[PDB]
């Protein structure tokens, strides 16, 4: 069985800070970035492993059943929708 | 073809198949819930193999 929780439903923080979004799930977990009307793009997979092509301002870590996505040095082109993805279960992510 | 035109087939025992499938559904409930409904459907598609 797969259980999902997404507590940061909406946040509109400014640029230059360090924001973090969390979601609690068991199993493998990937993070995706989705714009408006565009295809989603994989940022990190397996909780902490980085994908080639993603800038180094993205990082993540896990502790038990809590996955975090650290966003430092925000950019004017880094405002999109982010959601965590278990195999066949995708929660509606939040927008910045 | 010397004889009748017939179709190839296979036979399994219906009493043995329900006894064998009754044990797989008992062991499948260890990885899932105790009161779940386990169904068996046929193939969904692909090539003939």
């Amino acid at each position, epitope marked *: 069985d797969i259980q999902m929780t997404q507590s940061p439903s909406s946040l509109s923080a400014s640029v230059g800070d360090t924001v973090t979004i969390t979601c609690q799930a068991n199993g493998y977990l*990937n993070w995706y970035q989705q714009r408006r*009307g565009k*295809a989603p793009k994989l940022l990190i997979y397996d909780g902490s492993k980085l*994908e080639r092509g993603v800038p180094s301002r993205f990082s993540g870590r896990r502790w038990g059943q809590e996955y975090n996505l650290t966003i430092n040095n925000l950019q004017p082109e880094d405002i999109a929708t982010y*959601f965590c993805q278990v195999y066949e279960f*995708v929660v509606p992510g939040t927008r910045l | 073809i010397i004889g009748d035109i017939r179709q190839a087939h296979c036979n399994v025992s219906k009493a043995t198949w329900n006894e064998t499938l009754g044990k797989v559904v008992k062991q499948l409930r260890k990885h899932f819930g105790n009161n779940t409904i386990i169904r068996f459907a046929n193939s969904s*598609g*692909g*090539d003939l*193999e």
Partner: nanobody
């Protein structure tokens, strides 16, 4: 080089049948699954199913059995494929955009996606 081409949009009536194409060109197709995703306008993503490009065996959830039929087609030289997705009877709430993902490893890494095909009823 690894790209997944996407077909154009299509407008149909409630009760017709659609077909969304997906062409994978620049990698080894037979060693990676191809999934399908769908998102409604205003909601998140929703899983449609995968298809084994080597064998052809599809998989679909309980809410999609009997309607969607995943079918692939390979060329003679096996360098490019054509993944199809035919819907039997579209309802009124099927107005959405369909994607064409690609599973990379056992962690279900969908690194490359499709351009998207939005269909309405």
């Amino acid at each position: 080089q690894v790209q997944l081409l996407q077909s154009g949009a299509a407008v149909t009536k409630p009760g017709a049948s659609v077909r969304v194409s997906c062409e994978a060109s620049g990698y080894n197709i037979r060693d990676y699954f191809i999934h399908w995703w769908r998102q409604a306008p205003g909601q998140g993503l929703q899983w449609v199913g995968w298809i084994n490009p080597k064998t052809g065996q599809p998989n679909n959830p309980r809410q999609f059995q009997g309607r969607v039929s995943l079918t692939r087609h390979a060329s003679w030289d096996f360098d490019t494929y054509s993944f199809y997705m035919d819907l039997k009877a579209l309802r009124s709430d099927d107005t959405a955009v369909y994607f064409c993902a690609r599973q990379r490893s056992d962690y279900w890494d969908f690194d490359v996606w499709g351009s998207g095909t939005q269909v309405t009823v």
